[PDB]
Structures are given as structure tokens and as C-alpha cells.
Design a binder for this molecule. Structure first.
Ligand SMILES: [Ca+2]
Ligand SMILES: [Ca+2]
Ligand SMILES: [Ca+2]
Ligand SMILES: [Ca+2]
Ligand SMILES: [Zn+2]
Length: 316
């Protein structure tokens, strides 16, 4: 809508207070005009019809419990946008400042979130397996990253190329969590998963096997579930990415870590320059080696660590 840019305040899913960019025209709308062509947050009103209604509020204060998922979707989209702009010089997900749209309160008891090709969508959870999914900054950045991947490499959501697609989203969701300094870790979804149980998460990058996901290529899932295991086999790449950043010895293979900043630079380059819609794990390795080569030289420690990390998870 057309109006005056302003700033409101509210409380997120975890009860923390934050400022959010809104737009004023009779009502105050969740429309942030300070980033690209805008960040827009919508209310799906427990239906499955999308996008729903641009979020309208009478007084620019968002402290109602119904408000919480919208506050976080809107705010964390902004943070994710800032990460791509400040760190990788990328303007929104398409590189030309496309508007970012999210709907919250999607359906009833919906325990997922997703990018649907045009926008992000967040369930409220059922209150025991998940609380509202926009409460997790690694979740929001994971989904938004799917949009980045779709406009660049175009990795198909099937088999190995789909596992790569999921791992990239876990990797950048995590880097964005570290960027925001939001109690960062190498786990996925810990802030919104199982509010009854502390210390757990949906997936772990540092030790995928903790939840039954493979951490070596020899253990990859080869059946048909989950589109050929796109959320399962991602553990092999997540573990590789964790090793490149943090170092470690895994199945007897030792990796010298090069840290988060270089991990992000290497993977962002692989993603935007070398990967294609049908890339498999072996092609990911070549893309990553070539990226680190471009950036740091063929005899650098950085190239060496990328090679050892993929050797450690059995990807040749
Ligand atoms: Ca209000
Ligand atoms: Ca965390
Ligand atoms: Ca996390
Ligand atoms: Ca939990
Ligand atoms: Zn995903």
C-alpha cells in the first residue's frame, strides 16, 4: 500500500521485544519500505488460501499473542535480507530487489514452513511438536534461501540435487543465525521445535547422526520417501560444511577449519556460479573446490580443507 514509513514495536514468538518497520495509511501495515521493493507480511487467518490479507494493525503496537508470528516473520525476513546484501552483495533473492512476502497463521496445527515458488509460508505448529515456525531465525533464513537457490542454481527438489538444495538452506540458515548472533549454534530449528523438551532440534549439522541422518556417503538413503531423501541425505553435506568451518576428525580423516566467513564465501560462489539444476554430490565437491580455488588460490589451505572435508564424508 502507499503510505508513510514508520517504526512499530512488538513481541516475537519467544517473548522478546523488537522494533519493526511498518507503513502507515489509516492502519499500520506490516510493510517494510526500507529494504529493496519491500518486505510484506500477510495474515492467512488459519486458511490455506494465499497470500491472505496484508497485516493491518490499528496502533502500531504488536503485543497480542496472535501478533507474535507475524512480528518474527517480518523482522527475520529483514535480517536475512541484510545478510545477503551486506555479506554477499546480493539484493533480495532474485538479485534485483524482489519484494519478499510471507504469510503466517497458515492452516490449523501446521507443523512446517516453506517457500512455495513465490513466497514464504509459516504454520503455527500444533503446540507440542512445534510452536510457530517463524520464531526461529534459522528457519526463516532456510526458507528464504530456497528462493535464492531457485533463482540461481535451480537445484531440482529430487534425489542428490534436492539434498544439496536442502543443505544450502541449512547452511545459510545457520550463517544467518550467526550473523544475527541469535544464540547461534550448528543445529536447525531448536528455538521452535518441541517446546516441551530442551536441548534438541530438528537436524544437527555438527552431528547429523544424532537424529538418525547420514554423516557419510556410504550411509545415504537410496529409497523413495521424502523425494528420495532430500531432508535425510542433506546431513552428508551439512557435516561437510560443518567440518570446513570448524575443523575436526571424522571417520579418521582430519580437517583444519577455515571458519564461517570463508565457508559462506565458498558456498555462495559455488551456488551462484557453478551449480546447475541436476548437480549431484560429486559435482558439488568440484564446484566447491573450484570456488575456493578462484578465491584463495589452488595451493591455499582453503582448497585443502574443502578437499579433506568432502573426503571425510566419502564424497569423491
Ligand atoms: Ca496493535
Ligand atoms: Ca540457536
Ligand atoms: Ca540453529
Ligand atoms: Ca525442544
Ligand atoms: Zn528446505
Amino acid at each position: 500500500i502507499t503510505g508513510t514509513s514508520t517504526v512499530g514495536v512488538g513481541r516475537g514468538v519467544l517473548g522478546d521485544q523488537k522494533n519493526i518497520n511498518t507503513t502507515y495509511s489509516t492502519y499500520y501495515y506490516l510493510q517494510d519500505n526500507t529494504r529493496g521493493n519491500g518486505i510484506f507480511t500477510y495474515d492467512a487467518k488459519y486458511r490455506t488460501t494465499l497470500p491472505g490479507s496484508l497485516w493491518a494493525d490499528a496502533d502500531n503496537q504488536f503485543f497480542a499473542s496472535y501478533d507474535a508470528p507475524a512480528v518474527d516473520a517480518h523482522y527475520y525476513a529483514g535480517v536475512t535480507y541484510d545478510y545477503y546484501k551486506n555479506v554477499h552483495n546480493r539484493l533480495s533473492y532474485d538479485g534485483n530487489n524482489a519484494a519478499i512476502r510471507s504469510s503466517v497463521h497458515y492452516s490449523q496445527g501446521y507443523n512446517n514452513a516453506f517457500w512455495n515458488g513465490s513466497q514464504m509460508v509459516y504454520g503455527d505448529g500444533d503446540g507440542q511438536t512445534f510452536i510457530p515456525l517463524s520464531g526461529g531465525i534459522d528457519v526463516v533464513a532456510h526458507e528464504l534461501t530456497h528462493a535464492v537457490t531457485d533463482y540461481t542454481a535451480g537445484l531440482i527438489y529430487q534425489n542428490e540435487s534436492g539434498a544439496i538444495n536442502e543443505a544450502i538452506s541449512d547452511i545459510f540458515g545457520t550463517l544467518v543465525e550467526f550473523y544475527a548472533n541469535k544464540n547461534p549454534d550448528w543445529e536447525i530449528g531448536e528455538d521452535v521445535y518441541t517446546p516441551g523438551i530442551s536441548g534438541d532440534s530438528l537436524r544437527s549439522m555438527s552431528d547429523p547422526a544424532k537424529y538418525g541422518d547420514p554423516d557419510h556417503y556410504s550411509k545415504r538413503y537410496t529409497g523413495t520417501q521424502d523425494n528420495g531423501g532430500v531432508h535425510i541425505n542433506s546431513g552428508i553435506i551439512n557435516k561437510a560444511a560443518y567440518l570446513i568451518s570448524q575443523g575436526g576428525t571424522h571417520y579418521g580423516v582430519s580437517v583444519v577449519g577455515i571458519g564461517r566467513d570463508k565457508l559462506g564465501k565458498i558456498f555462495y560462489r559455488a551456488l551462484t556460479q557453478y551449480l546447475t539444476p541436476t548437480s549431484n554430490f560429486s559435482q558439488l565437491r568440484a564446484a566447491a573446490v573450484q570456488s575456493a580455488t578462484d578465491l584463495y588460490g589452488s595451493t591455499s589451505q582453503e582448497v585443502a580443507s574443502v578437499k579433506q572435508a568432502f573426503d571425510a564424508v566419502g564424497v569423491k
